[PDB]
């Protein structure tokens, strides 16, 4: 099975964290991928964006390792991206899947014009940057689809963004920086202070405080 190593993992396994949004609310770090496996479960669909073989020069020759770029996420508002480099492709893929699970962030969806139905696009213009690669996401009308390059399109579809406008600048040919910039732009959606979020924050008890008695009762 799974023996939790962290307090958060123990709270999640003993069915007292209702949703993944509590941990996001209290900004706690996820160090066990089994928490994400417990909350998102079978809704998560991962895929390998790229396997980049990187070589280190040695006296005998070149030492080759393979870096796996993996994007994961249910198509409903959660997306993650994980990069792991290993001596073998299968190990790198497993590690990148674990890291992408650990890096899952909540995605905020919005409306382009009239607010009818479920939110379909990004709430506003967001920009992500990773080593000269700038990715800009612009709200798009319903039914537009993702107007983007294949890598940002894959990440945005995995994030559940129905339709979006995209701009890119810099060496987007480097898939890792392109994907990381898209992930940064996607994760900036919930950090953006819009007027609908001006309402004063009402604090609730932290999972570590609200369930401290259960933690110490062991």
């Amino acid at each position: 099975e799974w023996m939790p190593v962290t307090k958060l993992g123990r709270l999640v396994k003993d069915m007292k964290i209702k949703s993944l949004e509590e941990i996001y609310l209290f900004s706690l770090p996820i160090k066990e991928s089994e928490i994400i496996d417990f909350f998102l479960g079978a809704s998560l669909k991962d895929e390998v964006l790229k396997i980049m073989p990187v070589q280190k020069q040695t006296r005998a020759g070149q030492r080759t390792r393979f870096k796996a770029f993996v994007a994961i996420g249910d198509y409903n508002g959660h997306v993650g991206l994980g990069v792991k480099c290993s001596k073998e492709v299968a190990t790198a893929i497993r590690g990148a899947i674990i890291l992408a699970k650990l890096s899952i962030v909540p995605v905020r969806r919005g409306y382009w014009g009239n607010k009818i139905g479920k939110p379909h696009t990004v709430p506003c213009k967001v920009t992500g940057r990773c080593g000269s690669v700038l990715v800009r996401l612009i709200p798009a009308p319903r039914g537009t689809g993702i107007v983007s390059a294949p890598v940002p399109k894959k990440l945005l579809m995995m994030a559940g963004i129905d339709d979006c406008y995209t701009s890119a600048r810099g060496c987007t040919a480097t898939l890792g920086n392109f994907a990381k910039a898209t992930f940064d732009a996607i994760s900036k959606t919930y950090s953006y202070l819009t007027p609908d979020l001006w309402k004063e924050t009402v604090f609730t008890k932290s999972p570590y405080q609200e369930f401290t008695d259960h933690l110490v009762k062991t």
Partner: peptide, 30 residues
Amino acid sequence: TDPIDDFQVNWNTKHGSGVTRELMRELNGG
């Protein structure tokens, strides 16, 4: 023919490009 093994062996040969394509097919819908 293991797509992963072919990639780990001769990704840096004349067949590296086609071997990469076969690897991407095995992993995802690439």
